[PDB]
């Protein structure tokens, strides 16, 4: 946990969202695969509502590109101030913002509605109402009097739980915690690293709990979810770069029941 | 009568043609805004994409007639032709194309066009790949004069006859009158093989446009005049459609009233 106090957003972004992993041209890559799961899921029309919360957003926005057109009130979160600052730089189009435009473009490409990427980013920026601090280790992760409309109609979280959880059991609790934020019948879209034990973010070296696809499913069932979909991306050799030891990436579509 | 005087006026006027001002006037916003699907930019790209998407227009070689300093008109084309010849009257335009081919930063940025083409072609292609293909497939950039009976000169590089021709906003913009327009059409048609296709885009009812200092003269033509010329030159007209310029795209860089797109096949 206290390791997260060294966490460098720019080094994280660079490590995971710039070439090679950030090169979206090849459709067999992890970036396109992620955007596709996201896009395909929302395209079904079954994941809808007014409000949505992104859990442990970090400094990234790609996880909301296909989401923003289905929810008028979007709340983004993160534990670190430095990440919330970095999101704001993109939200307010301030100087030095990270360039997500390749991801926007690809989301537009994938969605196939002939939308221009500027419109997509415009809609996202407009629908994100707030960037709030959060701790999934807390039974009320957002806190007491959070500005966030609760309960949310849906949740999104990518690369968070397994990355803030020393082991399987804490992972499970953290899931139960955020689950309280979700209205019954609501939807959760969860993405994460498979069988990963560490990753770097500049001077920070974060520990990760290695989880498998079945472990992820069981955890979801335990937390009271019906698993609508659960898919795995195996990490090709050329995307194994020495910034971590992730073996695969999972995508889960779960419904609170 | 005499063609030489009019043609000389034209050549003269174009010596003031500034590529940069022209690009700004026509391919930067508002006209270069590709977000509005009702805009002229997306209408053009859509016509070209839909046409190549029939699979009916293909082969080895393609010639773009009067390319100027633009490439958007080849974005959908380049996936169907291994060998592409670009062309223009002005050396300054040919250099402008030079900058883009070398992928120089000084060059004009067509990435919004490349992206929008990838977007409507619906193959999930990324724009960097499309641009890299176009650059690979452009085999030469040649001087051209559509008023000459051999527009490319004699014993020219271009593989002739070409399997298809593209031309956008050239003829009506270098032809002083309908008869000159018709002749220019006849000359370029000699470059197309029989059974080949011409894709033609141009201004409707326009008499002038601006390219910096240069305020140039244009023969205003109508859909029906365009159709008759194509028939006259020995084409079957496969498609001919018209875009009417919205008031807010009428910005005083020209007096264009609409844009036409013609798909025509040379009778053979
Ligand atoms: N106790 C905690 N509660 C919630 N988030 C935490 C947390 N501790 C660390 N985090 C955040 O978890 C994030 C993991 S990295 C994930 C970033 C982004 N979601 C992506 O898909 O790339 C970090 O930004 C980190 O600050
Ligand atoms: N006699 C001639 N023969 C062929 N092209 C000529 C010509 N005289 C001028 N041109 C070219 O006609 C062009 C018209 S502007 C069209 C540029 C481009 N095709 C586009 O779509 O924007 C100029 O580039 C100009 O140099
Ligand atoms: N956190 C995190 N983001 C990623 C993006 C791509 C990838 F292959 C692994 C990743 N881990
Ligand atoms: N030469 C030229 N290019 C154009 C692009 C759009 C338009 F509306 C008019 C144009 N004229």
Curated annotation (Swiss-Prot), chain A:
E.C. code: 2.1.1.28
Reaction catalysed by this enzyme: phenylethanolamine + S-adenosyl-L-methionine = N-methylphenylethanolamine + S-adenosyl-L-homocysteine + H(+); (R)-noradrenaline + S-adenosyl-L-methionine = (R)-adrenaline + S-adenosyl-L-homocysteine + H(+); (R)-normetanephrine + S-adenosyl-L-methionine = (R)-metanephrine + S-adenosyl-L-homocysteine + H(+); (R)-octopamine + S-adenosyl-L-methionine = (R)-synephrine + S-adenosyl-L-homocysteine + H(+)
Superkingdom in the source lineage: Eukaryota
Keywords: Catecholamine biosynthesis, Methyltransferase, Phosphoprotein, S-adenosyl-L-methionine, Transferase
Activity regulation statement: Inhibited by methyl methanethiosulfonate, phenylglyoxal, tetranitromethane and diethyl pyrocarbonate. Inhibited by 4-oxo-1,4-dihydro-quinoline-3,7-dicarboxylic acid, 4-(benzo[d][1,3]dioxol-5-ylamino)-4-oxobutanoic acid and 1,4-diaminonaphthalene-2,6-disulfonic acid.
Name of the protein: Phenylethanolamine N-methyltransferase
Protein's pathway: Catecholamine biosynthesis; (R)-adrenaline biosynthesis; (R)-adrenaline from (R)-noradrenaline: step 1/1
Similarity remark: Belongs to the class I-like SAM-binding methyltransferase superfamily. NNMT/PNMT/TEMT family.
EC category: transferase
Gene that this sequence comes from: PNMT
InterPro entries listed in its UniProt record: NNMT/PNMT/TEMT_CS, NNMT_TEMT_trans, SAM-dep_methyltransferase, SAM-dependent_MTases_sf
Organism: Homo sapiens (Human)
Any Pfam family hit: NNMT_PNMT_TEMT
């Amino acid at each position: 946990a206290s390791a997260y106090q060294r966490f460098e957003p720019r080094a994280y972004l660079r490590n995971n969202y710039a070439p090679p992993r950030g090169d979206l041209c090849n459709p067999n890559g992890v970036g396109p695969w992620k955007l596709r799961c996201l896009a395909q899921t929302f395209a079904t029309g079954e994941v809808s509502g007014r409000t949505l919360i992104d859990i442990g957003s970090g400094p990234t926005v790609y996880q909301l590109l296909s989401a923003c057109s289905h929810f008028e009130d979007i709340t983004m979160t993160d534990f670190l101030e430095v990440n919330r600052q970095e999101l704001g730089r993109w939200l307010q189009e301030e100087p030095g913002a990270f360039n997500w435009s390749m991801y926007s473009q690809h989301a537009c490409l994938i969605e196939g509605k002939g939308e221009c990427w500027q419109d997509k980013e415009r809609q996202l920026r407009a629908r994100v109402k707030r960037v709030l601090p959060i701790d999934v280790h807390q039974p009320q992760p957002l806190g007491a009097g959070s500005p966030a409309p609760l309960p949310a109609d849906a949740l999104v979280s990518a690369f968070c739980l397994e990355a803030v959880s020393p082991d399987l059991a804490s992972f499970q609790r953290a899931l139960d915690h955020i689950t309280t934020l979700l209205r019954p019948g609501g939807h959760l879209l969860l993405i994460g690293a498979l069988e990963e034990s560490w990753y770097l973010a500049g001077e920070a070296r974060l520990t990760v709990v290695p989880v498998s696809e079945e472990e992820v499913r069981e955890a979801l069932v335990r937390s009271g979810y019906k698993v609508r979909d659960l898919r795995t991306y195996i990490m090709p050799a050329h995307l194994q770069t020495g910034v971590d030891d992730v073996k695969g990436v999972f995508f889960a579509w779960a419904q609170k029941v």
